[PDB]
Amino acid sequence: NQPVTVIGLGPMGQAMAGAFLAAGHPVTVWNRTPSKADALVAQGAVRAATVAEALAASELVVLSLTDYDAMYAILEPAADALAGRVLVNLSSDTPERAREAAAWAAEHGARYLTGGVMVPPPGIGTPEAYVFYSGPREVFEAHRATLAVLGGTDYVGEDPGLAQLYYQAQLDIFWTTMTAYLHATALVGSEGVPAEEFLPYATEMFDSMSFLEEMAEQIDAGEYPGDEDTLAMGAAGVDHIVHASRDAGIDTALPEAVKALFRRAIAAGHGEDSFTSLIEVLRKPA
Amino acid sequence: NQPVTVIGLGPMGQAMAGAFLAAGHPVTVWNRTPSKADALVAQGAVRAATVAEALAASELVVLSLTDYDAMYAILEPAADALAGRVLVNLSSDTPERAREAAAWAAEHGARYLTGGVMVPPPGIGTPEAYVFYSGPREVFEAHATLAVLGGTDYVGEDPGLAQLYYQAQLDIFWTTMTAYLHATALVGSEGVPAEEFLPYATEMFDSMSFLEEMAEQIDAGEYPGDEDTLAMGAAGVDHIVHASRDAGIDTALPEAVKALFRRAIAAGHGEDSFTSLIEVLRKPA
Numbered sequence: 059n060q061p062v063t064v065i066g067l068g069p070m071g072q073a074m075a076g077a078f079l080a081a082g083h084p085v086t087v088w089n090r091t092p093s094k095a096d097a098l099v100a101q102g103a104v105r106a107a108t109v110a111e112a113l114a115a116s117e118l119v120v121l122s123l124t125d126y127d128a129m130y131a132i133l134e135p136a137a138d139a140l141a142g143r144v145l146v147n148l149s150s151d152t153p154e155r156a157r158e159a160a161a162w163a164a165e166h167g168a169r170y171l172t173g174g175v176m177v178p179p180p181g182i183g184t185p186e187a188y189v190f191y192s193g194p195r196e197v198f199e200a201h202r203a204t205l206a207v208l209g210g211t212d213y214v215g216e217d218p219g220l221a222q223l224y225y226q227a228q229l230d231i232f233w234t235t236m237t238a239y240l241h242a243t244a245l246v247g248s249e250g251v252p253a254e255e256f257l258p259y260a261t262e263m264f265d266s267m268s269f270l271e272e273m274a275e276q277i278d279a280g281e282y283p284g285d286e287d288t289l290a291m292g293a294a295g296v297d298h299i300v301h302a303s304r305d306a307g308i309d310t311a312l313p314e315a316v317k318a319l320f321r322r323a324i325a326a327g328h329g330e331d332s333f334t335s336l337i338e339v340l341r342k343p344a
Numbered sequence: 345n346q347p348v349t350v351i352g353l354g355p356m357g358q359a360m361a362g363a364f365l366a367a368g369h370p371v372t373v374w375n376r377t378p379s380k381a382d383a384l385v386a387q388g389a390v391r392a393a394t395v396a397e398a399l400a401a402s403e404l405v406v407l408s409l410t411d412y413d414a415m416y417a418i419l420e421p422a423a424d425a426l427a428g429r430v431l432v433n434l435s436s437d438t439p440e441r442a443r444e445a446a447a448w449a450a451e452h453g454a455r456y457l458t459g460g461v462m463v464p465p466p467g468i469g470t471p472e473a474y475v476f477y478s479g480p481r482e483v484f485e486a487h488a489t490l491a492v493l494g495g496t497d498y499v500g501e502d503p504g505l506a507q508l509y510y511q512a513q514l515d516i517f518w519t520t521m522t523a524y525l526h527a528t529a530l531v532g533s534e535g536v537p538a539e540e541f542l543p544y545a546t547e548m549f550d551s552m553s554f555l556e557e558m559a560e561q562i563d564a565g566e567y568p569g570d571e572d573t574l575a576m577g578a579a580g581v582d583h584i585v586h587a588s589r590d591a592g593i594d595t596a597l598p599e600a601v602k603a604l605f606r607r608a609i610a611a612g613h614g615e616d617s618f619t620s621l622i623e624v625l626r627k628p629a
């Protein structure tokens with residue numbers, strides 16, 4: 059009961075359009091590569107010939123593109139067709155690029171919402187699916203239901219860049235943690251321990267991290283009471299990891315980066331504070 | 345019952361000695377700072393007057409010291425008393441330093457078990473604690489007393505293995521903690537409290553349920569890159585670097601991740617699964 063346009067027919071976009079179509083929403087679609095639409099048009103989507111047609115076809119225009127450079131390459135030549143439309147950009151990019159695009163959309167008559175999808179293309183439309191949303195609350199509340207088709211709707215604030223900040227911070231946890239798991243698996247692997255043999259121990263390590271609330275409370279108070287886990291303690295242990303990694307013939311760049319941050323914080327006088335104090339150097343460029 | 349000596353009465357050694365004592369073992373203790381044994385001695389522990397008498401008091405000698413340098417400083421002047429003893433070094437150090445110490449102990453007639461303790465001092469004695477052990481399987485099998493401290497997790501004969509497993513677990517711990525704090529600082533740049541983002545970060549960690557598929561890929565050495573290629577990850581890491589830069593936060597951690605992705609792409613893995621990054625992590629630059 060709401061027309062929807064989907065610019066961007068990549069794995070993600072195709073999934074969104076299909077979910078919109080399977081929810082019964084009128085769906086118009088466009089893509090630099092039309093062949094990517096043959097499937098949805100066969101399922102009942104309208105392949106627009108131009109970007110202008112797609113934009114006019116619906117007020118709600120959801121964008122799933124590689125990056126914002128792609129958006130501007132698509133939409134700028136049709137910028138005079140953006141008036142009245144609501145652009146919901148779900149493409150990954152920087153917060154600042156989102157705040158710049160929001161201003162660009164405004165000057166061209168369009169409203170702008172930023173979105174960060176937290177599921178793979180296949181996950182779109184499942185209970186585990188949720189999308190960070192930021193921008194004008196009224197515009198969000200006006201199109202929440204339509205967007206819920208794709209997954210949970212999580213409005214995080216008015217700043218257009220906030221949704222992407224949340225997304226980037228989550229991927230910052232993800233990729234860095236994945237690299238740590240691979241580095242540790244390589245370390246034990248240097249003595250012939252299969253990855254599937256270390257997996258139980260790695261898995262239980264992550265289940266042991268049930269104290270993040272305490273750390274978050276420390277950060278939010280700006281107080282890092284030392285007690286059972288000084289930063290100096292972690293610094294000594296990180297040195298053992300660096301030295302073990304070297305001895306084992308594996309890469310040392312990752313543990314060395316962690317070590318240098320600990321040294322920064324100790325030089326700043328947090329050695330006796332809780333290791334949460336490390337955030338104080340993480341927030342300050344060296 | 346079965347005597348046990350504990351050398352090193354810092355927070356961990358004090359907790360280990362207490363556990364042995366509460367479990368009914370005869371316990372002899374030694375520490376460079378003797379005041380730290382007072383509370384234990386008041387409960388039945390024997391304060392050895394000399395390191396060598398501590399070694400002689402029990403065949404099983406548990407060491408809980410800062411590093412292996414502390415061990416040699418303590419034990420070398422008394423190396424002739426190591427004969428017949430079983431040294432169980434629960435001190436954190438490198439796998440190579442463990443192998444070296446095992447050879448030194450054998451030169452003095454002592455057997456050697458390496459241990460890696462995966463709980464803080466308050467965690468000793470819970471059945472939910474565990475300790476990696478490596479060294480002669482017959483020596484580990486003969487020394488029930490160790491279970492007083494927590495689970496006994498024997499990883500093999502190589503004396504370096506227990507510390508290898510331990511350093512790898514701590515590798516995950518500290519790097520993941522650094523990532524959590526950096527990401528928390530990133531959203532905090534715009535005033536999002538850590539306690540508001542934590543629910544989302546917790547979901548992230550609870551969503552890591554594919555590590556098995558990664559484990560099988562590593563063991564096969566096959567990194568089928570179809571769904572999530574390394575190139576796609578690198579592009580995401582670049583946005584993270586740039587967002588961190590724009591936010592005024594330190595970029596060293598994300599730049600370190602970015603450099604590893606670049607190395608893997610330069611090794612031909614751009615279109616492989618992100619697990620292929622292990623091929624650069626297994627080899628120095």
Ligand SMILES: NC(=O)c1ccc[n+]([C@@H]2O[C@H](COP(=O)([O-])OP(=O)(O)OC[C@H]3O[C@@H](n4cnc5c(N)ncnc54)[C@H](OP(=O)(O)O)[C@@H]3O)[C@@H](O)[C@H]2O)c1
Binds near residue numbers: 066068069071090125
């Ligand atoms: N799970 C996820 O994959 C996920 C999660 C969160 C966010 N995102 C964001 O959503 C995007 C889309 O998901 P994806 O990675 O599956 O697909 P993708 O490969 O990034 O496809 C992006 C889309 O952008 C289009 N495009 C790129 N450059 C263009 C240009 N110069 N002119 C016109 N169109 C251009 C592509 O058209 P063609 O099809 O013709 O190449 C394609 O439809 C991601 O790149 C990311 O930015 C994805």
Ligand SMILES: NC(=O)c1ccc[n+]([C@@H]2O[C@H](COP(=O)([O-])OP(=O)(O)OC[C@H]3O[C@@H](n4cnc5c(N)ncnc54)[C@H](OP(=O)(O)O)[C@@H]3O)[C@@H](O)[C@H]2O)c1
Binds near residue numbers: 357376380411434461
């Ligand atoms: N959460 C934890 O505390 C924890 C958890 C798991 C593993 N570990 C590991 O277990 C070991 C024990 O740690 P801990 O918590 O007890 O604190 P610690 O400060 O590492 O232990 C200090 C102990 O080592 C002794 N020592 C240090 N340098 C010495 C030297 N040069 N000569 C003689 N004795 C020396 C101290 O003697 P004095 O007491 O006389 O000063 C004391 O008995 C460490 O290797 C640590 O990495 C700790």
